[PDB]
Amino acid sequence: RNAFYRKLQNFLYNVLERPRGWAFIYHAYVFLLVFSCLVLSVFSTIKEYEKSSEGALYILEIVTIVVFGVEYFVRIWAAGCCCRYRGWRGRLKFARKPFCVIDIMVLIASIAVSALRSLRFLQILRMIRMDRRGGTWKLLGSVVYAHSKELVTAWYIGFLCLILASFLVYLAEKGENDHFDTYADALWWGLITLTTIGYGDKYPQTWNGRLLAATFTLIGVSFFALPAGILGSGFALKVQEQHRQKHFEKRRNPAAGLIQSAWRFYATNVSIRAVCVMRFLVSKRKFKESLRPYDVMDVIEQYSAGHLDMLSRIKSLQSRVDQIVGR
Amino acid sequence: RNAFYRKLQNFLYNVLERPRGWAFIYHAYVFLLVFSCLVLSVFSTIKEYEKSSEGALYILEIVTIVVFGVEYFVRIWAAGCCCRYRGWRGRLKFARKPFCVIDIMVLIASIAVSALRSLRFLQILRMIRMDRRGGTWKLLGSVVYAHSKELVTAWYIGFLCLILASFLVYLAEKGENDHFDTYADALWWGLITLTTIGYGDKYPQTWNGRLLAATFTLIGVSFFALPAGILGSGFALKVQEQHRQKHFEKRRNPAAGLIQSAWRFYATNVSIRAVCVMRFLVSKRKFKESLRPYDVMDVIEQYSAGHLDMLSRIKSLQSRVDQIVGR
Amino acid sequence: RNAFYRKLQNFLYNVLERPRGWAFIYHAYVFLLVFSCLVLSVFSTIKEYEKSSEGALYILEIVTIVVFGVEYFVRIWAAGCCCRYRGWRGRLKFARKPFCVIDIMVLIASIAVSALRSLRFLQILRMIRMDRRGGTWKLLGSVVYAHSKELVTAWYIGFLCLILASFLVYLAEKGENDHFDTYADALWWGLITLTTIGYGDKYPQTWNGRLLAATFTLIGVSFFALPAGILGSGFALKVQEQHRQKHFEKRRNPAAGLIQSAWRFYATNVSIRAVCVMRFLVSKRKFKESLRPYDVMDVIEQYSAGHLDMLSRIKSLQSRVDQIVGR
Amino acid sequence: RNAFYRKLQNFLYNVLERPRGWAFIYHAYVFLLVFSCLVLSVFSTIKEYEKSSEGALYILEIVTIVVFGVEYFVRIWAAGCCCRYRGWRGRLKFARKPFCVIDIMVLIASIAVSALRSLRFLQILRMIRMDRRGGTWKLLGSVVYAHSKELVTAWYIGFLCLILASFLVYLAEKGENDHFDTYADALWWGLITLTTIGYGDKYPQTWNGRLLAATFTLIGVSFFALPAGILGSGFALKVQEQHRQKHFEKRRNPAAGLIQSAWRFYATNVSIRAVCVMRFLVSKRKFKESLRPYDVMDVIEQYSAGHLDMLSRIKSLQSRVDQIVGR
Amino acid sequence: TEEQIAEFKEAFSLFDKDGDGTITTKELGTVMRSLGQNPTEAELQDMINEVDADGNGTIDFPEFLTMMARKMKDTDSEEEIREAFRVFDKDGNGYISAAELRHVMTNLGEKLTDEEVDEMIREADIDGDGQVNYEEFVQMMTA
Amino acid sequence: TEEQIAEFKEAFSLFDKDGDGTITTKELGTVMRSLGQNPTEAELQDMINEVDADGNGTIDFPEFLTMMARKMKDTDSEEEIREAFRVFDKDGNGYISAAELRHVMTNLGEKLTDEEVDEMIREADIDGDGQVNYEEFVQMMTA
Amino acid sequence: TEEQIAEFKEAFSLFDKDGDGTITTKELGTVMRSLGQNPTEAELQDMINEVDADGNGTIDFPEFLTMMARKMKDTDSEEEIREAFRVFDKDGNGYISAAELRHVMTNLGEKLTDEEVDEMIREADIDGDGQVNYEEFVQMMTA
Amino acid sequence: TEEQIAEFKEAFSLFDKDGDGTITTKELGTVMRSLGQNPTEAELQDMINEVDADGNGTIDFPEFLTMMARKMKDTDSEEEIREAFRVFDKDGNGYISAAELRHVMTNLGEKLTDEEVDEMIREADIDGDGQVNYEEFVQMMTA
Ligand SMILES: Nc1cc2c3c(cccc3c1NC(=O)c1ccc(F)cc1)CC2
Ligand SMILES: Nc1cc2c3c(cccc3c1NC(=O)c1ccc(F)cc1)CC2
Ligand SMILES: Nc1cc2c3c(cccc3c1NC(=O)c1ccc(F)cc1)CC2
Ligand SMILES: Nc1cc2c3c(cccc3c1NC(=O)c1ccc(F)cc1)CC2
16 A cells, blocks of 8 residues: 555645645644743743642643654654655655754753753744744845845934933933933933833933933834834735735746756757757746746836837838838 | 615615715714723722712613614614515524624623623623624734734744743843842743833843843844734735725626626527537636736736737738738 | 015915925924924923023013014915905905914914913914914825724724733732722723833733733734834825826826817807817816826726727728728 | 056955945944944943953954054055045045045044043944945935925824823823923823833823823824834835836936947037937937936836837828728 | 437537537637627637636537536526626615616626517516516526 | 707707717717817717716707706806816916917817917906916806 | 767858858748747847857857757756756645646647657656656756 | 038028928938938937927027037036946946947947947047046046
């Protein structure tokens, strides 16, 4: 029953590795399971709830270790679906994946288990391992890079405003207020107020201080809130762009051309061969040039191609009418 | 006077059920009326204002019950406009609607009236019933789903930043600060500061704590503010899209084709019948394919159709000029 | 020198009334002048700075009254530029403008001057009068109306979250925390925390309270921040739309047609008259149909017109080639 | 080896002046270096850490002065690449640049070094000099100017809401609350609450105060958060526009025409000359009209040109078919 | 049944002029022209894709027979026509006047002769109120 | 009046060549060509929709008479022409020079002969200041 | 080698009809037509830019020889074809059926005769599982 | 001067074939065709708007004389050509090689004969470094 064996291996690889549908339910389940361990550890930190929290946490962590071990074994087994990871050589190369070795370290350390500090560190490490593909980090980095200049503008001007406001309020409040006795305390106040956190541990009391704080909050608060707004709008616009580009989806014909071209090139193994290789180059360029823009540039280019085509047809018709005139 | 009876029934159904214009005035009136009951209950909770608040609340709640009863009865009566709910059978099926039964439960419990806790719970339940169509929930869910990946990125990285910053500040302030005596207190501080709530009950005091808090606020505050910005931009972009799509509105001809096709299909009750059913299929596909994109994809498709059609015409003219050449 | 008189009257009307360039400098000057009076009044409220603040405020307010009087007189005089306001009748009708009578009331009350309370009220009234055109209110109302459904969704769900979180935390903290002794105090805490104001006067202390506060802040804070983000994105998108629409500016030819049509209609004062009036109707419809869309709908309509026209030309060429075939 | 000399001079000018790639690494290095001096100064302000902070800061500042001096000298030397700054005259004119003279003042004052106050002022001055091109300020000013009307609407209405809410809460809390004893204190509270800073030093306590504070926070918080959202969305939209416009890049042919036109004009030194100068004018107009729109206006104009062209061709074909009819 | 199979085979033979049990676009177009209607390339390809469940561009006899086997109720178009008429239900009350119905049927979408609309009103004016219902209409259509 | 009704009927008869009291697009186009101007399909359909208050594409005599009955003031176009001129009031002061007025009237929108603009200035140069007003202008035309 | 150089020169001479060691677009088009294929202006210019590393629009013999010198592995197209087939790997499991493979080969992009696809399956059905792999496929292709 | 005025009048007479002191689009096009170049409607109208400071579409002799009076420096095009060449200054260093300069001049924008580029390099290769500067270039042209 090797057919059903392979089918099940494929299904398990689909679930454990990139899921699309209700395998997200399993992934969220294992998440919630580790998150529950984290929360129970947090409660175990408290002395009053130490006993019950520890009692539940022992079993919850043992279940976590069992599930992580079984999942890791099933993952390494189901990696066989991809031909890259076949046999012992291929599967060991699969274990070379950074997240696989990280997961192995997780299991080893957990079975081995500053004990509480180490437990907290390893909980954080499990959580970061949760991603396992880098999608979130890649997306965030992409959007940040896209808006690098605006983010840097916000950072620079907001930092300047923070420094200036903190120094001015320090000058106005150095003596009359216990809070701003050193420039560092004034900087702490400025950072905590421009972020709108406002702990209230420090705040100006002299009229100079309150006036300057008002006129500099009315600037710094907006500057510190900017990056969040910039990134949010960038994310929303990117979502809209992905939604639009999902429609036209013009990656098909270039791919067919490229694959048929490679097949012919292998079949080609002097002028006919020159034509074969040149058309293979043409197919490759079509593939990449379809890959590159993937946006309204294609639409504008299609408009231009249609326009020039119709002008050429116009010239042909003019030539025909002229020839009829001559005839 | 059954004609005026039906006209008034239709008007009342339009008002009570989906309104468009100044029936929103009545809906806002009944809202304000229940909201006033809620506020008066809140004031009744206070001992000092217990007497006057209770005195007003008795009459306000009795008026609420009267208006809700009359509105429910008028709604069940006016549901007759829709043929689906006709006669006792149809109107009883209408009462099967979840919000109708919820409203009945509201009336029964109110007339029946942990008394204060129950009153608060039922006020909340009335408020949730206020929607009665799920429009707000559906819209919010749609926009959240559209940006699911970005929201998950923000959630994941912001949660990681919260955990890391809380642990680092706890380490830096475990002994020297009374606030961070347990990891749970440090996590409370981290959550309250990254949200920019900043109660001020906890805040770092050691230089390690303040430094780490600064460098991790300058990240966590933006991450926690992101989801709001992402959703706001998504909502605004969706509004702009609805405004644009409101113009072209190309659902007319496909619908006319579909209804005429169904009429013919009924009239059709061998090759003529095959043509009739096949063209009915054509009409159905036209209807759905008009339904699906409802966006700029329609414009691009129209561009493609125009381009290919004009190219075909060009070929026709080329053939004609060639034939003239031959002649 | 009536020509220079009229030229100067026009220039002053342009400055005082709708300005475009460096008349904004004068408007900002008079603003700053009234704002300085407001700030000096604020300082006069303080006992310690009462003397100096009052001393400066006397002269600053007298200067304010002088400038407001001269500006009002110059405005009523320069309203003569518009032929609507000519002679005593026209200028009196101009004085009928709500902001003109508001300015008259301001001047009368100021010369007449709960004295401090009245002064504060009149300062607020001057500030609101500052607009004098309703532009800010109209713009804000327009953008709010555009996103009415999204704003209502945010309001509704955020209010529900506030009520639910406040009640749950009240239940969890009714006894163990001095802050939440009445439901009203819990609601105050919920409103102050979900807005991210976080006064810190109230905050949960029991583990139930802190847990529920965390899970409900992670929702309410975003919901309360939504409206700001929605409106900000709406404003930015509207700005982008205005920038785009500023280019094509297709209001010229319809207006020329309409004015020439009205001139002809006056000149027309039976079949010729029928054509004249009917073409006047055509011109009016062209004017309005140019007014209405003012967006990409025009562009799509132009595309459609070009398409259908070229298809008609194609039909003409097909007919010609067919006739040649016959010949 | 003047060739390698010039090559190295060009590379150094590229690095020090406008960089594109990994020269940003050097710029970030010198930034971090000055930022470290700032932080060490902040720590030197504290008495407890005065000794170690001063000890490190001496050497760090000396290194800063050395690096700034060498960088300034290398910059003045490498400015020779641009022909504008050649020889002593050109390089001295280069030193006329505002940032070059600012940098010279920086070195002079540092070597010369209210000593601590002067040091803080000069640290701020170095930081502002960091930009050296005004890019951040220009970008921020551009985006603010684009949304000037929306920002002014937010400012105006939010300021009115602040004034009104502060006065109302002052009235409601003048006697019963120690915080609001003067209108200035109430205004301080209003500014600190509508910004969502919420120090908690002042907050309403009477039921009037809490009610009014609730209903006015639910407005002022959004108004004060608006400008951040507006600017963030503006920045994101501008980024999207730059990304789109980066594609077509149509500035090539107009520039080629303009330069060839100028060459011909110089060569031209009567009807032939008239043609030369008129075509030079044509080239100049093409260049500028290409510079101006740089947006979708180009696409719409191209559509219009293609349309009118094809209609003219249609007329030509109609004339030809008519002539054939006659023949 | 046997008569249905024989008549379907005769209709197919009139359709697939090639005689190889494969109705192509050209033969469908020719039979359509014989019937009078003029099908375009888009119409023909949409038609074939609608009937072609294999993807070869031609239909075999069992495919045609099974597509014909679908009845009014088996089509499950009740919801589709319901929403379509709702789109045509301008007021949304659940009814539409005779004049508006005639206008939309004759002059929008596919133009169709007045005899067909007269027949539809004849077989649909159960109550003859002018504002004739469409919900029970489509219910009896599917039945 | 009776004379107005008779002249309107004569004009309609010259319009509706069919003689069935239904002015169609073709007859309107032919009469317009006889008048000299060339109306396009878009112009013809916009016109017919402007006059056709029923939707059948043809106009009966009472409809033509009632649309003709509208006077200058009854049209309530004062606001429309006022705002149009404001659009043409470049400065916005309430006046426009003779040269700019002539240019905009002759060379923008619909091209019209110089005699018409000469007549308009003759009947409108109440003050003859060059920068002739348009507000009182439109008031007097509407009256 | 010497034989390779001579055969390349003969092919070029058949290409550059001008005989000046500069293959132009017109000569490429003529030889393409002789071969049967019809190259368009876009195809011709894309090809010339692909081969023209100088920018003069014509190719000299050493350029032709050096572009021909590239082998299957030297092209470094393994990644390109890998991702292309992945795009054609609908499921993403790493395999594709014979029917879908033939459909994409002969009915999408550039239509290719059935003989070529038959030959590819003949030389590629190492296991003959229908769901034939493409990774080892392309590995052997590049080798 | 007097000779300049007379020669300008002769050139205008060759331009305005009408003889009424009003150079129209048709006459400009005819003289352009005589010169060899073919001006399009867009080019003709752009030119006329460039010269027509009144807006009547035709130019009188004083207008032609005053536009011709402009010299190289009076044009104030130094900044325009400076920025244009900067656009053509790919590296931005302030210099451009001879090969790239020739390519951009001959093959982009307006195609111009090789004699003109040879003459420009002859009159511009002050240093003959290949990477010839453009700043002093434009300074010397403007002078
Ligand atoms: N919000 C915000 C404000 C300011 C910052 C300053 C310096 C550095 C970072 C930030 C800073 N942090 C981000 O913008 C951010 C967001 C998301 C992310 F992933 C990384 C950084 C001065 C003012
Ligand atoms: N804002 C915000 C930040 C963070 C969150 C984290 C985990 C879960 C939710 C949120 C979280 N909540 C929403 O984003 C949200 C908004 C609207 C809505 F309807 C539901 C959830 C970590 C950081
Ligand atoms: N922000 C914000 C949140 C919430 C609100 C709720 C009820 C009413 C208003 C708001 C409310 N206020 C606005 O959205 C707003 C903004 C601008 C403006 F002009 C008017 C209202 C529940 C949660
Ligand atoms: N946020 C914010 C709110 C309010 C303001 C008021 C008056 C003046 C400025 C602001 C004000 N400041 C900015 O909007 C801003 C942002 C960025 C920048 F560069 C300059 C100003 C009333 C309410």
